[PDB]
Specification:
Layout (H helix, E strand, L loop, with lengths): L2 E4 L5 H8 L4 E4 L15 H6 L4 E4 L11 H20 L4 E5 L9 H14 L6 E4 L12 H11 L5 E5 H6 L7 H9 L4 E3 L2 E2 L10 E2 L8 H11 L3 E3 L3 H15 L2
Parallel strand pairs: 1-2, 1-10, 2-3, 3-4, 4-5, 5-6, 6-7, 7-10
Antiparallel strand pairs: 8-9
Helix pairs in contact: 4-5, 5-7
The structure holds zinc ion (3 copies).
């Protein structure tokens, strides 16, 4: 499979070559900002290039929120992100599952996700990514993902499995791919991250492979079971070696 990394938005093609990455993932803007993504002077060059570029949508998007002042801007920035991703010829857009405010509102959160998807304008595919923390999430625990998918599974939405998030959620990595695919039928992208924290911590602190607490063989096995392209979302200095390790261990 293609193996790469999450890189700075500044010069994805140079970063990919420096890291030995076959694919990269970027944010278009500040990951934590509500400002619309800005057009890039290099858009035509990125669109023409062969390197696949995945776009991570801003972290504050919460399509499940009951708060109109969150939900409505979330839909708008997701629309803008998909348009900006198409402008650079991106492979896909990744968006986190989001959350509600309290456990009683989970089912309504699924319906808000469906409503957002019923209005989404995109020329590039969108993947939902699982999340790490205890937050009344739509997509932290796999039991919740199963209930979510009963509502949104027919929309065409894809799925990105993040191994650090899975670990932080308390889900076992040994059969995570099998369990997710029994629900979604699909894993379109893997974020292959070690974690600085113990299993089930609910914290999201990525680590270079082997620098954290997840046995690297569990990560390799998950990558092989999924078969999908891989993004290492790990610290800059160790990232070339992370990619090279996975490449060698998967026969890529
Ligand atoms: Zn993410
Ligand atoms: Zn991730
Ligand atoms: Zn994370």
């Amino acid at each position: 499979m293609l193996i790469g990394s999450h890189v700075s938005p500044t010069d994805p093609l140079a970063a990919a070559e420096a890291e030995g990455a076959d694919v990269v993932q970027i944010f278009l803007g500040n990951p934590q900002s509500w400002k619309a993504p800005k057009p890039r002077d290099d858009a035509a060059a990125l669109k023409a290039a062969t390197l696949p570029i995945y776009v991570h949508a801003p972290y504050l998007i919460n399509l499940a929120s009951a708060n109109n002042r969150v939900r409505i801007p979330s839909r708008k920035i997701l629309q803008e992100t998909c348009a900006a991703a198409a402008d650079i010829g991106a492979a896909a857009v990744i968006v986190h599952g989001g959350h509600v405010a309290d456990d009683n509102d989970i089912d309504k959160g699924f319906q808000r996700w469906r409503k957002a998807l019923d209005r989404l304008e995109t020329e590039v595919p969108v993947y939902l990514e699982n999340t790490a923390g205890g937050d009344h999430a739509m997509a932290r625990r796999f039991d919740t993902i199963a209930r979510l998918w009963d509502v949104i599974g027919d929309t065409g939405i894809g799925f990105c499995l993040d191994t650090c998030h899975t670990w932080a959620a308390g889900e076992a990595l040994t059969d995570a791919v099998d369990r997710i695919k029994a629900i979604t039928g699909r894993i379109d992208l893997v974020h292959c991250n070690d974690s600085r924290d113990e299993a089930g911590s609910g914290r999201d602190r990525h680590a270079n492979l082997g620098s954290g607490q997840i046995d690297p063989d569990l990560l390799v096995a998950a990558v092989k079971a999924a078969g999908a392209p891989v993004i290492c979302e790990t610290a800059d200095q160790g990232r070339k070696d992370d990619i090279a390790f996975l490449r060698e261990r998967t026969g890529s």
